[PDB]
Amino acid sequence: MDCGKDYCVKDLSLAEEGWKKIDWVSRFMPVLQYIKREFEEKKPFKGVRIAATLHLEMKTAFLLLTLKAGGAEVSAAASNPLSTQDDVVAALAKAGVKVYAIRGESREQYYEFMHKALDIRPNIIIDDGADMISLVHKERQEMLDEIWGGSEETTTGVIRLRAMEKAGILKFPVIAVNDSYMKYLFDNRYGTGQSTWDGIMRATNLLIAGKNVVVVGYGWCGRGIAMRARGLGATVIVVEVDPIKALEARMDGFLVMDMKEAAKIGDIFVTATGNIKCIRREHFELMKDGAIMANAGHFDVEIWKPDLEKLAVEINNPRPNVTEYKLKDGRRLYLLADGRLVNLVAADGHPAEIMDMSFALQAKAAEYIKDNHERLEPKVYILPREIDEMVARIKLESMGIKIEELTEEQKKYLESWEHGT
Amino acid sequence: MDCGKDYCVKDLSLAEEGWKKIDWVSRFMPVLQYIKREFEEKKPFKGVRIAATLHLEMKTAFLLLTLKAGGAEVSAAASNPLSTQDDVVAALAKAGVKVYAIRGESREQYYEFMHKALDIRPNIIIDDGADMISLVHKERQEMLDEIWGGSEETTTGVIRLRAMEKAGILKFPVIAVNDSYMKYLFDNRYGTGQSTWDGIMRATNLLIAGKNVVVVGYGWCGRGIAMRARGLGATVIVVEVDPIKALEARMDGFLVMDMKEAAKIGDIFVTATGNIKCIRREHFELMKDGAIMANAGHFDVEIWKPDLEKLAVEINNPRPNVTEYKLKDGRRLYLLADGRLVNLVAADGHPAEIMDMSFALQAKAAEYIKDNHERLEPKVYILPREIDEMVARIKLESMGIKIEELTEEQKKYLESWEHGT
Amino acid sequence: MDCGKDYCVKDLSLAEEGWKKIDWVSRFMPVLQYIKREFEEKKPFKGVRIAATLHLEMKTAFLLLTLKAGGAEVSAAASNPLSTQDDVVAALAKAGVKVYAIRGESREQYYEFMHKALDIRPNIIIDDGADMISLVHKERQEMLDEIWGGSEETTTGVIRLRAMEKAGILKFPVIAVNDSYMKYLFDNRYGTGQSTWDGIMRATNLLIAGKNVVVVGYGWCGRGIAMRARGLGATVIVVEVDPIKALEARMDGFLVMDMKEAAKIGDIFVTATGNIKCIRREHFELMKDGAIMANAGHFDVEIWKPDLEKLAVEINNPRPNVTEYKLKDGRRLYLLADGRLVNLVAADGHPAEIMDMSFALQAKAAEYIKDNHERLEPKVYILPREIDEMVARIKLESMGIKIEELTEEQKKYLESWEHGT
Amino acid sequence: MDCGKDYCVKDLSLAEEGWKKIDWVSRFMPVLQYIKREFEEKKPFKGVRIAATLHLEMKTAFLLLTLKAGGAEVSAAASNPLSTQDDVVAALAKAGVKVYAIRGESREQYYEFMHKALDIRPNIIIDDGADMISLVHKERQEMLDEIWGGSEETTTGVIRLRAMEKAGILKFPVIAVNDSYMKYLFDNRYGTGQSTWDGIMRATNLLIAGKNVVVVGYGWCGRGIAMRARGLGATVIVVEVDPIKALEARMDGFLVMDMKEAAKIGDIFVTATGNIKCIRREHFELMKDGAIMANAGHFDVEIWKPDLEKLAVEINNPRPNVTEYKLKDGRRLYLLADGRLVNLVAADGHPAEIMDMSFALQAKAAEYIKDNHERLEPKVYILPREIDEMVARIKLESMGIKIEELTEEQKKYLESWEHGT
Ligand SMILES: NC(=O)c1ccc[n+]([C@@H]2O[C@H](COP(=O)([O-])OP(=O)(O)OC[C@H]3O[C@@H](n4cnc5c(N)ncnc54)[C@H](O)[C@@H]3O)[C@@H](O)[C@H]2O)c1
Ligand SMILES: NC(=O)c1ccc[n+]([C@@H]2O[C@H](COP(=O)([O-])OP(=O)(O)OC[C@H]3O[C@@H](n4cnc5c(N)ncnc54)[C@H](O)[C@@H]3O)[C@@H](O)[C@H]2O)c1
Ligand SMILES: NC(=O)c1ccc[n+]([C@@H]2O[C@H](COP(=O)([O-])OP(=O)(O)OC[C@H]3O[C@@H](n4cnc5c(N)ncnc54)[C@H](O)[C@@H]3O)[C@@H](O)[C@H]2O)c1
Ligand SMILES: NC(=O)c1ccc[n+]([C@@H]2O[C@H](COP(=O)([O-])OP(=O)(O)OC[C@H]3O[C@@H](n4cnc5c(N)ncnc54)[C@H](O)[C@@H]3O)[C@@H](O)[C@H]2O)c1
Ligand SMILES: O=c1[nH]cnc2c1ncn2[C@@H]1O[C@H](CO)[C@@H](O)[C@H]1O
Ligand SMILES: O=c1[nH]cnc2c1ncn2[C@@H]1O[C@H](CO)[C@@H](O)[C@H]1O
Ligand SMILES: O=c1[nH]cnc2c1ncn2[C@@H]1O[C@H](CO)[C@@H](O)[C@H]1O
Ligand SMILES: O=c1[nH]cnc2c1ncn2[C@@H]1O[C@H](CO)[C@@H](O)[C@H]1O
């Protein structure tokens, strides 16, 4: 309703509560605070314009204000129509961030707002899922030479960007922030493990313990979801298409079976494949009455909703973020968060300390593009490992943890080859 | 304020949303559904009057409607001023339950409303914390002879009632529902373990993994909170006064230390003692900046608020359910949910499937008083174990689990002595 | 071969290695060391004669030498023909303990040696499984009036003694050492959890992780076996006849099914029921090729060997403590330790620190009978809880652990009833 | 000493018991059985000569017999003097494998025997630790041109060989078997995790629950040892020099601290660094009386023995595989297995099912060298991932596990970029 040239938000008067959310989580993001203190002294982004597509909650807002405190002019659009937190977005507009996002946006508004954030003519694109980078190449080619580079936050976006590189139609360098150690080993695994179950408990008020929990995919996200489910008392069943990862899951104490077999016995289904149609018609037909389904991957195509809609004679909404599909035989299957990332739609996303480390890497990626975009080709690059090591050492210092250091004798010993028995 | 002779609630128009919540959780309470079916067929509480003091959310409402469906006239009052959900109690008033409760109500309203609930002149009293049973004994002795018996839901209430029995002031029989196997082994341990971290994550959006979590008390709630804290990645420290339970915690993999030593290193403190002043001035003086404190016990006297108030130079409110106490040296200590039951005040309480089991026991305890009050004494009794076994068997059938049965040969072997080596 | 009036052992020349085993574990039994220091100063067992039936390994030997250091004259027979460690027993004979035990004893030698230990005419009988107490009543009635009392170490023996009491034919008081908190919460649960898997790994050199482990019984032993199996990476399936314990196992994250269903899928079967014929013919007929079976209960009647012998066309012994039953269709099923307690026959029994606490209670039980046998009836008694608390406090002191103490205000608060909201 | 031109073993009569052990573990090695079947049908190593340096127990023997069954002439030498099992190597000599190994052999015999194994003039060298590959390069250059290539089994050996490649002294290609997915993710983590505690329990008979377990190194072995220590009830502390891995350990629930601080509080220390002098004088000076030390790394230089010797006033041997170092103040520190690979020297090594996977990779690496040596360079290569996938798929079939397969639609989606929101 408060919609103009410089922003489009639901209600500017929600800003006071948004500021409190941003201030609260920033108390627990020491790595990004450390970087912000530097950005304020050196203003490395003076004159630089930055367009961002991220999940617009209070940790994201602190990243954007950090970039703004480094002197950047910043625009923002939502990365998912339903992950936007309206009060936080109101606070970003009052701060001078050109943010275009209303929670519950239509698909068309999603793209209209993404285009409005692009109007800033960014030198740097910060993206989560690669929609903005894809949109620039497909509908806004008039500004590619202005773009120094982009960065991509999540696995599904990195896969899209690499296919763009393979097809030769990527036109500027992108940093695969998702591919950094301090990202996928912590965000994808520990962050999703906690916040997926946070979201599922919040939407349902159901018991995890003594449930058959079916985790589809045992990559970084899935093994984190499986680890925390087990930690909450569930019997965990893992579905994989990779035989090495299936054996890993067995060795971790989990049942491994295929999707039809898992569909007969699961109580709670969570998808984390990054793929399309992992759960479709013939799986829904086998599910027990009252089964709960949730998706943790980036796009809502992992649980195939049109198959659910075709099976159902009634579609009801008994709770916020719970869609009920009632089948011909009377069975009711429940889909959480409309099949979209359950941690960000039913809850508050990853915890503050996790996003601290991811978004610290995003800030260093943006600084990396600024400094090196002339040396880079239109390809997908990974940040140098020294940036991972810097982030880890700042985190450990803020926890009061001191680790052993290699002695010079040890350094020589590991580089040598004559010291056998 | 919508308050007639029959009810007193915040806002009757909220009732539609309370019904949805009640309908939702009831789909996942099979044991109580099974009991509700029989109560509707046989009407065993026809002409019986029941007054309840419970935490007034969804699952409590389904219990109260189950009793009413069995013929009972039911009155209800809050067990904690801040656990009440205003939309659920609006639905209960519309349904004919004489409920007197407003979220946030004053202590004076808490007791005024408890008296209004008692105006029904009950035959059975269902209590959570033993205030209502204590109130009849202190201010409403004119209806003691009408009361068949009471039932107590929680560990703190059972302790009070056995102290009343030891003192000779208990005037009618009391069923200690908390002492049933199907209660304290499931509700107190598995329920509290999950819902305590539900509430803490909900209030703070902070990471549990890699935190020092201090759990005070290693009784049934304490070991549940510890089990799930560990399941979520935390390093757990247990503080106990019972030496056997301290050893149990060690063997279970936890650090054990006293409260001063734990105060210096904890990031998150959770009390589960049912005692007074477990965490007090000298502990607050030792905690790290940004320590987070939560109480899982029934009364908010475990973390001693007045000592935080005396220590503080400012008291701020950065989030819902987060009080900030700022000390002279700039440290900020955070108290969740005002030091009250964090699972019920910052979240939705125990999961539906847990309360299904607890409240099935409450329904049966009410039936047990109806059928046995004429041959019970003014003492504290425990439900016969056949009822625990019935609740467990109904729950197992609803899960599709079929267990082995003792053969006659095995029963005779277990009662013999001549079959050694 | 070295067999006389005062002892019967395999080889006296093994004593030097037995002494080393006894000295080693005694370094890690501080509670029994504490008690031994007292026994040496007060000699409370001067003139007292003690007959013991225990598993004759090096922790048991230290208990017996502790009793001897208190001035007791001590005899000993094995509690299982196959748990005796010949070198330890040689060391006991050189110390003056009248020990009659050879590893691999026949059933008849087992009883002939048990009778020889009885020839001491004991005032106190220390028993594990209740064979000696049963033998005295059935074949050695000429010495009952000399016997002050007995104590019983394990669950299966306590069940036998209580049936003896119910039949009115128990003739002296017995202490149910197994029923003490510091016994079944630690020995039965944590001790058996570790040492069962110790024994199974040692006999087989097989991988626990990624196996279907079927635990029969979820009492104290079974839940300890299940907990450690899961900790070693196994998928754990629990078989129970108690619906409450079955639900507990579900809530702990384990699969629960009946024995036929478990027999089709288990890779490793462990029995811990204390019952007869939990695994019999129609379970063996469903087992996968190469299934491994082990028993942790006291008697070898839990896995019904005669059904295995009838099914097999060849019975082979591919490894020590592995019996191979080859079936008509070519399947091979492996029974460990001849179906006898796998932790004590395939390995070294419970770890030293666990037996420290159990055998400390056994020493205090013997001292309890000495001091109170005149006040006691021919019944089964449990040690007073103060002895449990003493043992726990000595253990905690030896670990360097200090616990919180209740303040006087807290003591009053927990005994009060007027402090509600 | 039974030593001809063709073998040198302790005692040929032990062979019957070695065969039983070999036959036993082979029943549980399905992947290697599958490969053995093909090797016998196709005889791909006919006329090929193979020299191996491995830990000579049962599973190693089945690998060597598998190679021989494929037509190979096989020689073998010990990878560690104290990991050799004299009965197994007796069976290998009887079978025609030219094995030169005695348990406890001197360092001079270790190298003499390695030279005897090399007297076969091998075409393929299979190594564990890279001594044999290092020995050919330093003392036996007269057969470098006959050698097709070598394979390295372990992390320490791969480090040495890549240092030889970086220095230009490597003269023939080398397969880093340790770097295969089906190796380091299973062998190094799950295998070492189980067999390290197998060996420690076997040597000490002490309780793991409620101990402070210090794990030095959080690589693949270290995190396996930590995972299973926690699974057995211990409080685990990780010591690392890598800051990312330190953070991983925290998030996994473990305390992280440096080695001096961990030295003061550990009860059990386990090194898994592959480095030198991780635990040294100043740490021994800080440890508690009765601390137990064990090494899981390939060379016994992680716990620095000479510093214990200088600190000690007595060195005693209270148990097999337990050295006692008594210090001036009476403290006794215990070193297990002489500081060598505790799983192999104090127990039976990794479980059969783990070595099945590792040694299946060795068999295929030997086949890979046979088929590709004419187009490889003097470099360190990793086996193609198709072989890892083949090993994992054979293992899954033998477990009865059927996993889902990527549809063609899913493969095309994973390679597209236009399908966003
Ligand atoms: N906050 C969040 O919810 C969050 C955080 C990080 C990543 N993600 C999203 O999660 C998804 C994956 O994250 P990752 O980092 O785990 O990817 P990853 O590639 O490590 O794991 C993907 C796994 O899915 C498996 N898989 C693919 N199709 C499958 C199928 N049909 N059945 C079973 N298994 C299948 C693959 O074998 C692979 O192991 C992506 O969409 C990523 O964007 C979400
Ligand atoms: N939040 C919920 O929904 C929920 C659920 C069940 C019970 N409860 C409440 O939780 C509390 C405990 O329930 P329980 O069933 O665990 O009781 P319990 O007696 O099982 O456990 C209490 C433990 O606290 C220990 N303790 C007492 N004072 C202590 C101190 N000063 N320092 C350290 N340890 C101390 C005691 O030794 C005892 O082991 C009660 O108030 C009960 O009503 C709350
Ligand atoms: N060192 C050891 O190996 C060791 C240590 C302590 C006790 N024990 C022995 O272990 C056995 C039990 O020990 P406890 O203390 O666990 O007994 P417990 O009674 O706590 O557990 C016994 C369980 O077995 C279950 N059960 C009985 N028959 C069953 C059946 N047919 N199928 C499935 N479950 C069945 C019962 O429901 C009960 O829960 C006894 O024989 C005891 O002597 C051995
Ligand atoms: N016992 C077995 O059967 C077995 C099995 C596999 C590997 N290994 C041996 O175990 C060792 C490690 O194997 P990996 O595969 O774990 O190696 P790796 O490199 O995965 O892990 C080594 C870790 O040690 C850490 N580290 C190095 N020096 C350290 C120090 N001074 N203090 C603390 N941490 C330190 C490094 O940071 C690294 O993370 C190697 O020697 C390998 O050959 C033994
Ligand atoms: O609370 C959050 N704020 C911002 N980004 C988040 C939060 N939680 C997860 N992600 C990010 O969302 C991506 C999936 O689209 C993941 O890569 C994750 O890093
Ligand atoms: O969601 C809930 N509804 C009703 N009661 C609850 C819920 N969660 C916990 N308790 C109950 O509160 C008592 C402590 O005062 C506990 O006994 C528990 O059974
Ligand atoms: O190492 C040991 N020494 C002596 N007794 C033991 C050991 N391990 C277990 N038990 C005891 O054996 C009983 C079963 O018959 C159990 O009660 C246990 O306490
Ligand atoms: O039982 C075994 N037999 C043969 N090799 C083994 C066994 N257990 C571990 N290793 C191997 O020893 C190497 C360290 O030197 C590890 O790489 C591991 O694969």
Side-chain angles (χ1 to χ4, degrees), chain D residues 55 57 59-60 128 153-154 183 187 298 341 343-344 348-350 355 359:
Chain D
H55 299 286
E57 49 70 65
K59 283 94 64 199
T60 286
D128 189 337
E153 162 85 11
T154 202
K183 207 289 179 163
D187 181 308
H298 180 79
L341 299 163
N343 61 325
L344 282 148
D348 292 302
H350 284 0
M355 287 332 287
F359 280 166

Coordinates of all heavy atoms in Angstrom, one line a residue, chain D residues 55 57 59-60 128 153-154 183 187 298 341 343-344 348-350 355 359, ligand 8:
Chain D
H55 N 48.6 -54.7 6.7 CA 48.5 -55.2 8.1 C 48.0 -56.7 8.0 O 46.8 -56.9 7.6 CB 47.5 -54.4 8.9 CG 47.9 -53.0 9.1 ND1 49.0 -52.6 9.9 CD2 47.5 -51.9 8.5 CE1 49.1 -51.3 9.9 NE2 48.3 -50.8 9.0
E57 N 46.4 -59.5 8.8 CA 45.4 -60.3 9.5 C 44.4 -60.9 8.5 O 44.7 -60.8 7.3 CB 44.7 -59.4 10.6 CG 44.2 -58.1 10.1 CD 43.0 -58.2 9.1 OE1 41.9 -58.6 9.6 OE2 43.2 -57.9 7.9
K59 N 41.4 -60.3 7.0 CA 40.8 -59.6 5.8 C 41.9 -59.3 4.8 O 41.6 -59.5 3.6 CB 40.1 -58.3 6.2 CG 38.7 -58.6 6.9 CD 38.8 -58.6 8.4 CE 39.3 -57.2 9.0 NZ 39.9 -57.3 10.3
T60 N 43.1 -58.9 5.2 CA 44.2 -58.7 4.3 C 44.5 -60.1 3.6 O 44.8 -60.1 2.4 CB 45.4 -58.3 5.1 OG1 45.3 -56.9 5.4 CG2 46.7 -58.4 4.2
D128 N 50.7 -49.8 2.3 CA 49.9 -49.2 3.4 C 50.9 -48.5 4.3 O 51.6 -49.1 5.1 CB 49.2 -50.3 4.2 CG 48.3 -49.8 5.3 OD1 48.5 -48.6 5.7 OD2 47.4 -50.6 5.7
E153 N 47.2 -47.2 0.5 CA 46.0 -47.5 1.2 C 45.6 -46.4 2.2 O 44.4 -46.3 2.5 CB 46.2 -48.8 2.0 CG 45.2 -49.1 3.1 CD 43.9 -49.7 2.7 OE1 43.8 -50.1 1.5 OE2 43.0 -49.8 3.5
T154 N 46.5 -45.6 2.7 CA 46.2 -44.8 3.9 C 46.6 -43.4 3.7 O 47.4 -43.0 2.8 CB 46.9 -45.4 5.1 OG1 46.2 -45.0 6.3 CG2 48.3 -45.0 5.2
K183 N 36.3 -45.2 0.3 CA 37.4 -45.5 1.3 C 37.3 -44.5 2.5 O 36.9 -44.9 3.5 CB 38.8 -45.5 0.6 CG 39.8 -46.3 1.2 CD 40.3 -45.8 2.6 CE 41.3 -46.6 3.3 NZ 42.0 -45.8 4.3
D187 N 35.9 -46.6 5.7 CA 37.1 -47.0 6.4 C 37.5 -46.0 7.4 O 37.5 -46.3 8.6 CB 38.2 -47.3 5.4 CG 39.5 -47.8 6.0 OD1 40.0 -47.2 6.9 OD2 40.0 -48.8 5.5
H298 N 48.9 -43.7 11.7 CA 49.6 -44.8 11.1 C 51.0 -45.0 11.7 O 51.5 -46.2 11.8 CB 49.7 -44.7 9.6 CG 50.5 -45.8 8.9 ND1 49.9 -47.0 8.6 CD2 51.8 -45.9 8.6 CE1 50.8 -47.8 8.1 NE2 52.0 -47.1 8.0
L341 N 48.9 -48.0 16.3 CA 47.5 -48.3 15.8 C 46.8 -49.2 16.8 O 46.9 -50.4 16.8 CB 47.5 -48.9 14.5 CG 48.1 -48.2 13.3 CD1 48.4 -49.1 12.1 CD2 47.1 -47.2 12.8
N343 N 43.7 -50.1 17.2 CA 42.7 -51.0 16.7 C 43.3 -52.2 16.1 O 42.7 -53.3 16.1 CB 41.8 -50.3 15.6 CG 42.7 -49.8 14.4 OD1 43.8 -49.4 14.5 ND2 42.1 -49.9 13.2
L344 N 44.5 -52.1 15.5 CA 45.2 -53.3 14.9 C 46.1 -54.0 15.8 O 46.4 -55.2 15.6 CB 46.0 -52.8 13.7 CG 45.1 -52.5 12.4 CD1 45.7 -51.4 11.6 CD2 44.9 -53.8 11.6
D348 N 41.4 -56.6 16.4 CA 41.4 -57.2 15.2 C 41.3 -56.3 14.0 O 41.0 -56.7 12.8 CB 40.4 -58.4 15.1 CG 40.7 -59.5 16.0 OD1 41.8 -60.1 15.9 OD2 39.8 -59.8 16.9
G349 N 41.6 -55.0 14.1 CA 41.4 -54.1 13.1 C 40.0 -53.7 12.8 O 39.0 -54.1 13.5
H350 N 39.8 -53.0 11.6 CA 38.5 -52.6 11.2 C 37.6 -53.9 11.0 O 38.1 -55.0 10.8 CB 38.6 -51.9 9.8 CG 39.1 -50.5 9.9 ND1 39.4 -49.9 11.1 CD2 39.3 -49.6 8.9 CE1 39.8 -48.7 10.9 NE2 39.7 -48.4 9.6
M355 N 36.6 -53.4 5.7 CA 37.8 -53.8 4.9 C 37.3 -54.4 3.6 O 38.0 -54.3 2.6 CB 38.7 -54.8 5.7 CG 39.5 -54.2 6.8 SD 39.9 -52.4 6.6 CE 41.1 -52.5 5.3
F359 N 39.2 -53.0 0.5 CA 40.1 -53.9 -0.2 C 39.5 -54.3 -1.5 O 40.2 -54.7 -2.4 CB 40.4 -55.2 0.7 CG 41.4 -54.9 1.7 CD1 41.6 -55.8 2.7 CD2 42.3 -53.8 1.6 CE1 42.7 -55.7 3.6 CE2 43.3 -53.7 2.5 CZ 43.5 -54.6 3.5
Ligands
LIG8 O1 41.8 -55.3 9.8 C1 42.6 -54.6 8.9 N1 43.2 -55.2 8.0 C2 44.0 -54.6 7.0 N2 44.1 -53.2 7.0 C3 43.4 -52.6 8.0 C4 42.6 -53.2 9.0 N3 42.1 -52.1 9.9 C5 42.6 -51.0 9.3 N4 43.3 -51.2 8.2 C6 44.0 -50.2 7.4 O2 45.1 -49.7 8.1 C7 45.4 -48.4 7.6 C8 46.3 -47.6 8.5 O3 47.6 -48.0 8.4 C9 44.1 -47.7 7.2 O4 44.1 -47.1 6.0 C10 43.1 -48.9 7.1 O5 42.5 -49.1 5.9

